[PDB]
Amino acid sequence: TDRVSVGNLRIARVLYDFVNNEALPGTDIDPDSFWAGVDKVVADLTPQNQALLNARDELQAQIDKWHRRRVIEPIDMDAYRQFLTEIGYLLPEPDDFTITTSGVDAEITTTAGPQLVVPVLNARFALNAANARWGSLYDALYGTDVIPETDGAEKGPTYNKVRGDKVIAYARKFLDDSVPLSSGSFGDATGFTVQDGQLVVALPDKSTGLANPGQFAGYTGAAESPTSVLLINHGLHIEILIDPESQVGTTDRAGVKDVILESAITTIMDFEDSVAAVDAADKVLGYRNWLGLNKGDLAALRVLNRDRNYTAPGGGQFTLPGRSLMFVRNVGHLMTNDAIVDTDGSEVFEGIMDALFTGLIAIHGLKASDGPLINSRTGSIYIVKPKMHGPAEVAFTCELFSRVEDVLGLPQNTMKIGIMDEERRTTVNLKACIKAAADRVVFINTGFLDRTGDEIHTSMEAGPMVRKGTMKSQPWILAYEDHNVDAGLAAGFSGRAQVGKGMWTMTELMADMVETKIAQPRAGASTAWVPSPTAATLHALHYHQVDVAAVQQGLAGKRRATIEQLLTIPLAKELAWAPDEIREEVDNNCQSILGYVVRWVDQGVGASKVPDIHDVALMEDRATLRISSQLLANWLRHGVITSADVRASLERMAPLVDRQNADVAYRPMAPNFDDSIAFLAAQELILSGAQQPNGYTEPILHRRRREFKARAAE
Numbered sequence: 001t002d003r004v005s006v007g008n009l010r011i012a013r014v015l016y017d018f019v020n021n022e023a024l025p026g027t028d029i030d031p032d033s034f035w036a037g038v039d040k041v042v043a044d045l046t047p048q049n050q051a052l053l054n055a056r057d058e059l060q061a062q063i064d065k066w067h068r069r070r071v072i073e074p075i076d077m078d079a080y081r082q083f084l085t086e087i088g089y090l091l092p093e094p095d096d097f098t099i100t101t102s103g104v105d106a107e108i109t110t111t112a113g114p115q116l117v118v119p120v121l122n123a124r125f126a127l128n129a130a131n132a133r134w135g136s137l138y139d140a141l142y143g144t145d146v147i148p149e150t151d152g153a154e155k156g157p158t159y160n161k162v163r164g165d166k167v168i169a170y171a172r173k174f175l176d177d178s179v180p181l182s183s184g185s186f187g188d189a190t191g192f193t194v195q196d197g198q199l200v201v202a203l204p205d206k207s208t209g210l211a212n213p214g215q216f217a218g219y220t221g222a223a224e225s226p227t228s229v230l231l232i233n234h235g236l237h238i239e240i241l242i243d244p245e246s247q248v249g250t251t252d253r254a255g256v257k258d259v260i261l262e263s264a265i266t267t268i269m270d271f272e273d274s275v276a277a278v279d280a281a282d283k284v285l286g287y288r289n290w291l292g293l294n295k296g297d298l299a300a301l302r303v304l305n306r307d308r309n310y311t312a313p314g315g316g317q318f319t320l321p322g323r324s325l326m327f328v329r330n331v332g333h334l335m336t337n338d339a340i341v342d343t344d345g346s347e348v349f350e351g352i353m354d355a356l357f358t359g360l361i362a363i364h365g366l367k368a369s370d371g372p373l374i375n376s377r378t379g380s381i382y383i384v385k386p387k388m389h390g391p392a393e394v395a396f397t398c399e400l401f402s403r404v405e406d407v408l409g410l411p412q413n414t415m416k417i418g419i420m421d422e423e424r425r426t427t428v429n430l431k432a433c434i435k436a437a438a439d440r441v442v443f444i445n446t447g448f449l450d451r452t453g454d455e456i457h458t459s460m461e462a463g464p465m466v467r468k469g470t471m472k473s474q475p476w477i478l479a480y481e482d483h484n485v486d487a488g489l490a491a492g493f494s495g496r497a498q499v500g501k502g503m504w505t506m507t508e509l510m511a512d513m514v515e516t517k518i519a520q521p522r523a524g525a526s527t528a529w530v531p532s533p534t535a536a537t538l539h540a541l542h543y544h545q546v547d548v549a550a551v552q553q554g555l556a557g558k559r560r561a562t563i564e565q566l567l568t569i570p571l572a573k574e575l576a577w578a579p580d581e582i583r584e585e586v587d588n589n590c591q592s593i594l595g596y597v598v599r600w601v602d603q604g605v606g607a608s609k610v611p612d613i614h615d616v617a618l619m620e621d622r623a624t625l626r627i628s629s630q631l632l633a634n635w636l637r638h639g640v641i642t643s644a645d646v647r648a649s650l651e652r653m654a655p656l657v658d659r660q661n662a663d664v665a666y667r668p669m670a671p672n673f674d675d676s677i678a679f680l681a682a683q684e685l686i687l688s689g690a691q692q693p694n695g696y697t698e699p700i701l702h703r704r705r706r707e708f709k710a711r712a713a714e
């Protein structure tokens with residue numbers, strides 16, 4: 001029956017073999033003790049994990065009933081707040097405290113910069129992400145719409161010199177703004193030299209040094225004519241590559257070939273929202289990539305970068321990390337996976353399993369590769385825990401990590417937690433959530449997409465919600481973002497932990513990203529999420545413009561969001577929409593859902609670029625699916641749309657998704673809709689949306705992907 005018996009557990013053979021043959025060797029952990037530890041942790045923690053999921057369902061049923069029992073008209077906020085407090089949703093705020101987390105890397109406690117999130121099941125993307133610590137500014141500007149494709153500056157099959165000159169000019173202006181010269185502009189530089197340990201820049205008429213000579217961090221090659229100059233601004237490195245022999249350098253006034261930016265400071269290897277892993281075979285593929293990353297031998301030959309060698313201004317030698325500091329995002333408390341079943345045939349909680357397996361694998365990252373150890377030099381394992389609801393759930397994750405550390409023979413508190421603030425019950429009790437993880441917390445981050453999905457589901461019974469596009473400007477979300485920064489700064493996060501903000505999803509709109517995303521470090525966020533190594537390089541420009549440490553100091557002690565603002569439900573006003581607007585929102589949500597779901601169910605791809613109704617390429621994950629499906633479920637629940645409208649929109653958008661795809665492994669949905677597991681999954685997400693726990697998409701997606709693989713097997 002392809003399973004291995006260990007106590008009360010029945011382990012899929014592929015997982016048992018992977019752990020024994022690949023994960024355990026080199027950790028000095030006894031295989032028999034590891035497996036007995038897995039059995040004991042699962043048996044001991046499964047009841048509290050179930051109790052917490054039951055408490056979520058109970059609180060939601062109480063809120064749903066409360067909204068149906070409203071006669072009013074404008075919601076009575078005082079009565080709503082009193083009700084949430086009585087049911088235990090809204091808990092008392094604890095007294096002021098400071099976090100005690102220790103042994104954390106400088107990339108987290110001090111450096112403000114981009115954070116890249118990548119699906120761990122894609123080895124090529126995981127490799128590029130780990131390597132994205134250093135990225136080419138010239139490649140990021142040339143290859144994207146940051147430099148407009150106006151008449152003359154368009155991209156073609158070959159290098160366009162007019163476009164190349166615009167890239168060079170943009171980078172020279174970046175240098176002037178970031179590392180200013182004492183006199184003149186970098187645009188007029190003819191050369192660079194290191195004289196008496198000082199950077200000397202040659203201008204046509206004179207020579208100049210830096211306005212702040214401390215911004216000179218080092219160089220490569222000879223001091224008289226360096227091969228590169230290393231600068232530092234706001235704790236982020238900038239490297240000017242000097243090579244007059246190169247095609248670009250030949251055309252350049254100072255022979256500059258490229259400007260390299262320290263870009264993705266940290267990377268999150270994702271096992272959650274951006275991947276589709278429904279059984280042991282899928283989990284092993286992910287665990288094996290995570291293992292290859294920690295051992296430093298993952299290779300696609302594309303391999304992991306080594307540290308970078310530099311000469312200090314004075315002449316001595318030093319090194320800088322060549323790779324992004326890695327976190328792993330485990331799944332949350334909800335799902336079970338049949339990778340492990342108990343004697344009764346009951347599936348084991350996936351979050352428990354992820355803590356054991358990703359934690360075990362992370363041990364390899366704390367020791368010498370095959371040279372130096374890949375990841376944490378300070379001895380920490382960085383785990384992001386998503387979708388937690390309130391401080392009892394955070395307390396549970398901390399107990400699970402403590403129990404895992406005991407099984408792995410690791411010091412207590414080795415396993416650090418990146419808290420996602422992406423559920424309403426966490427937002428409203430944020431201070432108590434940080435306190436419950438006070439000795440393990442390394443970040444708080446506003447996962448705004450899941451947070452929007454939770455906002456829709458929680459108040460599902462209150463009335464029809466505003467359009468998806470209107471959500472970003474609603475009072476609740478603006479208060480949520482500010483409250484997050486306030487709670488983190490009040491808990492002493494400055495100099496100790498990251499205060500993070502969300503994902504930019506418009507992958508092709510890089511000019512818009514460079515214009516807009518600056519709002520996040522201006523709001524005191526020490527990091528924000530980016531979808532690609534190119535977006536990391538461009539978002540790094542924002543941290544050179546904004547002094548995040550100064551912004552945070554200025555925000556100290558402010559309380560900019562009240563509990564009433566956090567609780568403002570995003571209900572639409574009566575008569576808000578004309579028929580064309582309703583139809584556009586329905587079609588847009590159906591296209592987004594079908595586009596994403598078809599690749600999830602039929603191909604096991606958890607993150608896809610899906611063009612929306614306005615032909616804008618959007619990076620879709622489970623969280624964007626949670627919003628779209630919950631919004632349509634909400635509109636169907638309150639009579640904004642009929643069941644005939646939903647079906648007709650799904651059938652209309654299905655051939656358009658089929659066209660956008662084929663591909664090669666692609667199976668079209670139209671015309672035999674009822675024979676398409678992917679189409680039926682999309683339909684179920686909408687029609688059963690109101691009945692999914694907290695509006696989560698995994699139960700349906702996992703069930704439908706498992707059904708697709710079964711049909712393909714027979």
Ligand SMILES: O=C(O)C(=O)CC(=O)c1ccccc1
Pocket residue numbers: 117273274386420422446447448449450451502503505531607619620621623
């Ligand atoms: O906002 C949220 O809930 C995050 O958890 C976002 C997220 O996972 C993501 C990852 C890759 C692509 C698009 C969104």
Ligand SMILES: [Mg+2]
Pocket residue numbers: 064
């Ligand atoms: Mg109900």
Ligand SMILES: [Mg+2]
Pocket residue numbers: 273386420422447449450623
């Ligand atoms: Mg999320």
Ligand SMILES: [Mg+2]
Pocket residue numbers: 234547
């Ligand atoms: Mg400054």
